[PDB]
Design an enzyme around this catalytic site. Structure first.
Site, short mmCIF file in Angstrom:
data_model
loop_
_atom_site.label_atom_id
_atom_site.label_comp_id
_atom_site.label_asym_id
_atom_site.label_seq_id
_atom_site.Cartn_x
_atom_site.Cartn_y
_atom_site.Cartn_z
N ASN A 4 0.81 -1.20 0.00
CA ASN A 4 0.00 0.00 0.00
C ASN A 4 0.85 1.26 0.00
OD1 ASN A 4 -2.63 -1.14 -0.08
ND2 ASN A 4 -2.40 -1.76 2.08
N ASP A 56 9.56 -5.78 11.78
CA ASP A 56 8.77 -6.40 10.73
C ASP A 56 9.44 -7.69 10.24
OD1 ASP A 56 6.48 -6.50 9.05
OD2 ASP A 56 7.49 -5.17 7.57
#
Ligand SMILES: CCS(=O)(=O)N1CC(CC#N)(n2cc(-c3nc(Nc4cc(F)c(C5=CCN(C)CC5)c(F)c4)nc4[nH]ccc34)cn2)C1
Length: 291
Positions: A24, A139
């Site tokens: 995104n 992450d």
């Protein structure tokens, strides 16, 4: 001032070949840098749906990657100041086998336990190195590990990486999330640390030993435990309650007990009791060497 040499990768010679990854807020493309106009294949990361705040974060990300030089971290090459030096793109080496998440599925039939442990060792060593810079990755997941060749993987993306404050062992995120990789104190206190990266490393180790089989991913397993029909914040509330009271991802099919024990030790709710990346690299390399 220009943090990088702006003449190294001139936009007119950086030619697009193929898309490699897309989210995104960013994408990575395969490009070729051909200054002789007659070059090297490189990977180029760019923002999507950019904002001033995301551009500032991207500059911090580029500075992070440029500061890292290690066999298990993807190589920074430079920056392209495109759009007439009014935009930024990050130039990196192209790793020919793509993400470990996809490679494991494509090549599971040639990847045995000792190979998964080699991948585990290399990720651990990249994380030891990050910790020496006081960087918190935030992450870690197989989708963010890249494969250079059958014997070398590298941590491939640093879009969420933060530098610890000088006087603190955690970074508190304000406005936030791969929740099914998060440590409990990241869910309940927004706190990220080396030890929360160790929790997430346990999830990466689980992912490796599932071979990314359908229905065995962390989101699929946690949702099966929580209840697949739940939606929105109720999911988070149930995940917190589950983790606090010792609910955990299951031992993958075929996974040795010793390796599941490493996962479970990474998934300790007591932050200070989780092993260090140095502990983990030695333990995994000793397992490999003793096999
Ligand atoms: C979500 C926001 S993000 O898009 O910014 N994000 C996603 C993100 C995740 C991470 N790390 N990523 C990074 C890259 C990337 N890939 C490569 N090589 C590559 C080679 C390949 F052969 C293939 C195939 C394509 C077709 N298949 C069928 C087969 C394999 C491939 F997909 C990638 N080299 C790189 N060097 C530096 C980065 C990088 C890719 N994805 C970073």
């Amino acid at each position: 001032a220009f943090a990088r040499d702006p003449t190294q990768f001139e936009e007119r010679h950086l030619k697009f070949l193929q898309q490699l990854g897309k989210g995104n807020f960013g994408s990575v493309e395969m490009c070729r840098y051909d200054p002789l106009q007659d070059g090297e294949v490189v990977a180029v990361k760019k923002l999507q749906h950019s904002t001033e705040e995301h551009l500032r974060d991207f500059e911090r990300e580029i500075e992070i990657l440029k500061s890292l030089q290690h066999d298990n971290i993807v190589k920074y090459k430079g920056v392209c100041y495109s759009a007439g030096r009014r935009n930024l793109k990050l130039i990196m080496e192209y790793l020919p086998y793509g993400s470990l998440r996809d490679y494991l599925q494509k090549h599971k039939e040639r990847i045995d336990h000792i190979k998964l442990l080699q991948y585990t060792s290399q990720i651990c060593k990249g994380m030891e190195y990050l910790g020496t810079k006081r960087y918190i990755h935030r992450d870690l997941a197989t989708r963010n590990i890249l494969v250079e060749n059958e014997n070398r993987v590298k941590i491939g993306d640093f879009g969420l990486t933060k530098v610890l404050p000088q006087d603190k062992e955690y970074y508190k995120v304000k406005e936030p999330s791969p929740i099914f990789w998060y440590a409990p104190e990241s869910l309940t206190e927004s706190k990220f640390s080396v030890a929360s990266d160790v929790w997430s490393f346990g999830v990466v180790l689980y992912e490796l030993f599932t071979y990314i089989e359908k229905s065995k991913s962390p989101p699929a397993e946690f949702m099966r435990m929580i209840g697949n029909d739940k939606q929105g914040q109720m999911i988070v509330f149930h995940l917190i309650e589950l983790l606090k009271n010792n609910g955990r991802l299951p031992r993958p099919d075929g996974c040795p007990d010793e390796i599941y024990m490493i996962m479970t030790e990474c998934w300790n709710n007591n932050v200070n009791q989780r092993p260090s990346f140095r502990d983990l690299a030695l333990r995994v390399d000793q397992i490999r060497d003793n096999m």
